[PDB]
Design a protein around this nucleic acid. Sequence first.
DNA 1: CCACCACGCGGGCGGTAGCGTGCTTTTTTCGATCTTCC
DNA 2: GGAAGATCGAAAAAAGCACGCTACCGCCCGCGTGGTGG
RNA 3: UGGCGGUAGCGUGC
Lengths: 1321, 586, 49
Amino acid sequence: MVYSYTEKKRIRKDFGKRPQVLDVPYLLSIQLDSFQKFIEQDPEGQYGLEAAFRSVFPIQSYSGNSELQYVSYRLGEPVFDVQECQIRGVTYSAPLRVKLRLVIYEREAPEGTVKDIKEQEVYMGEIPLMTDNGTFVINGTERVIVSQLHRSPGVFFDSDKGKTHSSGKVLYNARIIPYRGSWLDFEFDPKDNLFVRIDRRRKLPATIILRALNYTTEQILDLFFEKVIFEIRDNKLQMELVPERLRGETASFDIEANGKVYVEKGRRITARHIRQLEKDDVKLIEVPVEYIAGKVVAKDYIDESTGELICAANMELSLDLLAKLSQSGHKRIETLFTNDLDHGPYISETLRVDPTNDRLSALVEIYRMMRPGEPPTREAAESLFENLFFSEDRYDLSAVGRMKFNRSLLREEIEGSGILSKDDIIDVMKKLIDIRNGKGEVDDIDHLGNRRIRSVGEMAENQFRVGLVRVERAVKERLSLGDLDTLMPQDMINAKPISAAVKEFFGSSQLSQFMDQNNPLSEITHKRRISALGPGGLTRERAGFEVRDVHPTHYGRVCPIETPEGPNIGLINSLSVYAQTNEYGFLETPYRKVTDGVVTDEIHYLSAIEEGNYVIAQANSNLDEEGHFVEDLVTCRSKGESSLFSRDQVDYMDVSTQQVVSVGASLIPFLEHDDANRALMGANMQRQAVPTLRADKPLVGTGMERAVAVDSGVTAVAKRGGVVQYVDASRIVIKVNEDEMYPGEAGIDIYNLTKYTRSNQNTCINQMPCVSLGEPVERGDVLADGPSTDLGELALGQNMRVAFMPWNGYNFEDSILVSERVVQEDRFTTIHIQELACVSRDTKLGPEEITADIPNVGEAALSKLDESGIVYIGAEVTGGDILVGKVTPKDVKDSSLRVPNGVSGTVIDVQVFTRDGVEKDKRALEIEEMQLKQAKKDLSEELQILEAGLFSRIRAVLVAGGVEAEKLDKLPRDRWLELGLTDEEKQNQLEQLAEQYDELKHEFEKKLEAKRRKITQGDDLAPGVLKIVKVYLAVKRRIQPGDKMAGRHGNKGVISKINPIEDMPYDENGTPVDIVLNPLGVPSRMNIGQILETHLGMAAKGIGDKINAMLKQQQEVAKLREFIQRAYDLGADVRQKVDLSTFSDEEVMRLAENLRKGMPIATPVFDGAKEAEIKELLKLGDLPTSGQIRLYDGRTGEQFERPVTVGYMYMLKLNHLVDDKMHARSTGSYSLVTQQPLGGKAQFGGQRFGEMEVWALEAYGAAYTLQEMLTVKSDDVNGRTKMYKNIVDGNHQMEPGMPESFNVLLKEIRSLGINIELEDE
Amino acid sequence: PPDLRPLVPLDGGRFATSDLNDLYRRVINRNNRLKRLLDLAAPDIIVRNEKRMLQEAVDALLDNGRRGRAITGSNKRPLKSLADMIKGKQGRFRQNLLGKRVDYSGRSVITVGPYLRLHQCGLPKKMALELFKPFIYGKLELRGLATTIKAAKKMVEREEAVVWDILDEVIREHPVLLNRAPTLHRLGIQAFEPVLIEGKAIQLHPLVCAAYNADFDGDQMAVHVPLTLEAQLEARALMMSTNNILSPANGEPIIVPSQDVVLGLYYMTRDCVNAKGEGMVLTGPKEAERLYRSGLASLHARVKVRITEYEKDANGELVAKTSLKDTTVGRAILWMIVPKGLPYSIVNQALGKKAISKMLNTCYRILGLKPTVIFADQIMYTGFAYAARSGASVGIDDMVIPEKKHEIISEAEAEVAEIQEQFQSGLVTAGERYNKVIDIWAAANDRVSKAMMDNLQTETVINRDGQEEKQVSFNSIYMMADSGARGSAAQIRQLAGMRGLMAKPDGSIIETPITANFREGLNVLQYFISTHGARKGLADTALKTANSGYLTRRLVDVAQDLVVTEDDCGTHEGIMMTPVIEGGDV
Amino acid sequence: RERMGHIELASPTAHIWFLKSLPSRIGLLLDMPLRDIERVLYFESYVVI
DNA sequence: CCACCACGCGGGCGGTAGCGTGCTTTTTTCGATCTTCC
DNA sequence: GGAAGATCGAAAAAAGCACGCTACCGCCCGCGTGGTGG
RNA sequence: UGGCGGUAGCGUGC
Ligand SMILES: [Mg+2]
């Protein structure tokens, strides 16, 4: 296998013996593809906008002469691209133009044929598009819509585990959850009765629903019961006996057939009697007349002579009723087969308790229950019942819902109508009755096969459909309201509802969250996130314990360790590395098919439901050549549990060892050696590391850094292969290869790197080139490294030298001791960019303007400000300085924006937004000039390349006409085109080339005109504001005590002291350690992964030091090749094979230069290097195998009594800086209602003394402290002023006064009509 | 009054209108409409409907949502009526009366300062300057440097050297109340003497950390400045850290070494077999220390030292007894920091965490409170210093895997297989075989843990002066596990022995346990099985914090008005307390 | 911050606190069911005096 | 004659109807039996 | 032999759901109706 | 520099 250009620079030593059968897929594939399904022009109406339009359109007005139909839809070209939308603060969206045809039918004609047709294109709002990185730009801010895990539509059966009714009896219930409609629930009463509820209302008998479905009592009994025939023979009432019906009952009489007494009176019926009956094949049997008395009739029986029914259906028989039936001429009757353990009489009891007796009465009762107050009637009740569950508009079972409904009911076909039917309800009732009887089993609510994933596309389609139905209601009203003589479809419909709905969904929804840009890992995790919250979902407070647990079905689909800790734990998850989504929304995971005991290469994607049927072997199974199993009794999992199985009983195998971990959790080396809690904390804290100014590759990694960096949009990848024509710190220009060329194309790719642009977390986004001039590149190769990325590899922290030992208690439990070298080498300084926005509005007294002269200010204050009233770019400012000078009329008062107190830095970017129709200041002119210069530079490069090509063509044409080499070389470049030639085809081709050249010049001139018009176009603003000035402040924050740092194994701490370099312990060679950590945190936290990572990093740094030492001595390339080959060949049957004989003897030098800082090591998430491999790698270098050396105390000097564990560990700097948390207040602003100090550091508020603190003070007995902190510090205004004056005067005395909050409460209670007052007496 | 329902002036000319104003406007409009319709002599139904609507509006204003549909807001939210903002957590009572934001307060992260004393806490210079601004202003005015408040403010802002000197002077003995966010009990807030430091992080005394339940992993704590003589004296006398050494809940001491002091004291007070300098005779602890510092005698060497110990006499005096004791160099060195009254038997042992706590309790009981704080500070200093000198470290070779683990695992697997085949032959049912498998695996895990403990605690061998013998292990992991610094027996078992059986979230136990150590790798299946318990525990803690807080609040209220107001009632009644016995133990 | 106002209602209206908060003060004083109180209050049924 | 700006007065929203739907504990009321008698 | 007290479970309504802190986003009626300008 | 709702995060037996 041949390495790529970006990989040949620095090859990572990869451990692991399991071959890679399937590569990691695109991480951002769940989102992007989904939105594509929302945008793609579907030939059939089943997905997206086309499906919504086909569902809504066409529409017919109340009058028969009007119709409106939809033809096609098209998404327009966005006016601004992503960068312009982000910088200008506008929403990145595209127009939606729909072809609509309005048809006026011939009302005069009885058939209503077509009379007039008007076709047009109607604009129907803006659709926010999705960028290439799977994120949206709403109002200039990056937003991410997370997938929602909700209940799958269909029929679900469950039951309370005896909690209700306080006797342990289980009440079985079934629910029908539709995608769009009214929920229908059936429940079992404690008295064994069926009840039906609609939308969680008061319970009604289900027989009411059955009667409303036009079913009589006889039909209901036939459907829900099996008839037993009693025939009146000449004597003894011969009846057709089924032997199976005799199981589980007693012998009410002497069962004897054909003169054979099978059972005597009063003997229990055992299986011997039924098998005897089946063998003897007895159908008829004698039955006493009293035995029928306990039976229930099955159908109405009416006497022909009298014309009146002796007995109706469904009531218990009796001796007198039996005699009346016998004397009326009846000979055969039917009864219900009722058992107390197999076939309960639930339907009969429900019919008994049912008050209704006809379809009309049931419909009236249903209407009364659904719509109380309104007068019930036949028409309204019938219409409501038909539209509730049998109308395509009100009720809509989704395709996945219908599939689940069919699968649960064991139906063969999985495709059906989207509305309910009589058969569906009958089958649901039958299944519920069977479950109550004992047949079958209930479903699992937490099973991952019963939960659906809704991506951004589905919610967007739902919101667009809501807007569409609103608009179609409006158009239905308008068509009948108006007269069709001259109406136009452009003004016929309105786009405001759809635009408002989509804007609210994309900007003000619980799932359209503010995307976090701490590091690329955070963005990847946020995009690949699943939230159970949101509309139509679970609640954070009302969640419970079961929903937060790890179901066995989560294996390979949902990461078990990657989840937030706190209130919303278990409700938020991350997709696995290989997990994807079905066409029905269900999560599925890959597996390798196993045939004839060998593991094949074909990959099958299995869902949660179908995985249980098969037997799946775990990934950590040893395999020999050709795929056989070396061991017979391999461990597998059959149905939600793990057990041993024979080698021939396996069906599928795990694709990879990273199948169950997420993207974030797969970046932790030696994960198997880490505790679950510490692994969870480390995974959660990895995505909080701010990017350092100098990215450092991880010495110990998992090999997933490349995929994370490439899939994320932070880095600039090459779209087409070629060579780097011009590499610059701000832009890269590459020349594409002739193979990837296009007709009529210059063939130059220009990448404009984003430099020093603030992220959503006020961090710094910087891209630096990683290629040199003339370096060939290929498609997919990284050209520039994004933030916290090194040579295409994710780099969140730094490889810091660490030693595990207590040091005078400075580390103590979790604190971290940091050497002065870390500050000196500038290894942890971050860059933070902060916005400062000043708004020049239009007050009613006069329009405020930005000017360089401010009343009653010093000259030094405005010295930084230029003649335009805006601070100079690149000028360092501190707290209280003036940035932009704005004065508003009162004559004018100072309202200029000022730097907030405690904020410093340097101004690096100034942006000016001006409302259209307002003159632009010269600063905006300069900014527009710079943008025009950049665009003109790009277009001039393209134009010069094309002009060089055209002039080469005309030179060739001239040489064909006549060589004239000396004359051509002695002529100006532009004068070549006009040269004359003899009358022939050469002149014709020359003039055609001249025409092409001038056409190209005109085209590029008009392109430049369009670009300059776009950049100078005025942007819209809010009503009342005429100017906006935004200033960016850049601050370099250095490490200091109080900052929070952490590793990748959940080990976190705060810096306690910046120790001097000479104070830190040093080894024999005299090199001091950089970080000192307390070993006491290792045994308690189970996180042994950090120790193994430290040992591996020490081995890697030893290898790198040997390489650097060999490089310093100017050794020949042969020795370097041999050493690097030996280092790479180390291992135990590693899958990675690196051959240095094919590196052209020059790339070896670059590889050695890259590796001189240390050999990178890739440790898979569960196939990592063993301890023996680490010891062998340590032995390869000049380091002890034990991993511990003898350190010398820096301050004191002698050897430490015991060897200590030193090495190199990857340390991260979390986004919790002490300067951002430090806050203090003596006095300041107060609330205008309760007269209490404000809250928060931003508002310069004071700390809140809560109820717990008050209780603690009361327990201490400090009455005076509590009184002074309650009254004279917060509320008592006179008390506060007097106390301040006394302190200034040097007197420490106070006046308790009276808190204002109590007075406010008294006034509020008085406003409630209750007289409350203070009685002095 | 209008100010209780203010109109916030917003940018652009808009005004923020409170819900009370909207409800009042609705009521006024309805009343005016009713009056106008009554003037017009409307029919009975119209005036009745108007009166009903007025009544509904009045009810909504007084308490919205009590009856009928609640009046919605601008963005589909219920309006905040008069009674809505009175009750509840966000109501006036629980937001502005029981608790309130206060001035002269700050918040910052907390670090560890080993040099601080029990009554001292580090305070950053900037925070101290901000908090003590009025005091600095007053002192500056008194000194004559500033003749007005504006000049003092400018001088404080400019931060001259005189301002720093004044700030140092004003906080000489001015206590500050340091408090943590989860104030479960009265120990959550304590008074400390500030010591000026440069930085932005508050330095905390390690010994009080157990009282604060605070870890140095991003913790943030608040500081309040008492600003009157009564409050200052209450902080000095009642809430000072030196006065809080016994927990009011049970009486047990709270100032106990936790992680590093215990380890250092255990390492110092330990005896080897053939350590350097063994068998020497020393004239006192000073000679022992001078030997240890000079690198001429090991800290674990067994020697004989002549020491004098002071015993408290019956009348209250101290009598000195001089005798030769066989001990170690480390114990002799540590003996000097021990006060006179304590006997020598307290430090003549391994001196684990329990022994250190017992020694501190004995010192408090005998000597009192004034020497106790000094003894605790000296103990912490010595423990930190000797823990640093020891250089204890955790390595991959420290956690040893027993050589008999493989045989035990193999025989347990063979027994499980034979039980499974016997069940398959039909002799036993599913429940019996499941119970047998569970018992077999539990016995195997217990035997593995016992073998691990036997191989770790004392399997070390040492060559004495003439032959070989055994002693207590010096392994680092065992050193911190036995001394009680960190970890426990189960934790060491999980590190080195098998992880044992694991239970699914429902509650039942899984037949196949995790037979892999933490030192060795764990396959995917074992990790997935083990994740269930961690997830269950985390969810339990998350849903338990709120319940515990609610129960604590209810208990606090139910006993919020009980104080000691008498000395004796003369009652001849009481409870007949007896020792509690349940089953076969006390 | 202290001065209060007053609105003169055209017709008397009952206080919701003394009417809905169980037990109903008006209903307990008048010995009549709360449903009758709601019916008369919101103009559903006449009441004799 | 049409479109943008200011000003005052009601109130679920929008529609030729329906929208909801994963908690626990305590208190109140009511239909239905019941049951107990005068 | 029907009416009043018992009760009894079942259903409906009300109140609660830890403490501090940080950051971002959205909003702070709104719609008809008259005024006026192009 | 005034507040509500939503979202996410921090510290809370190791
Ligand atoms: Mg902590």
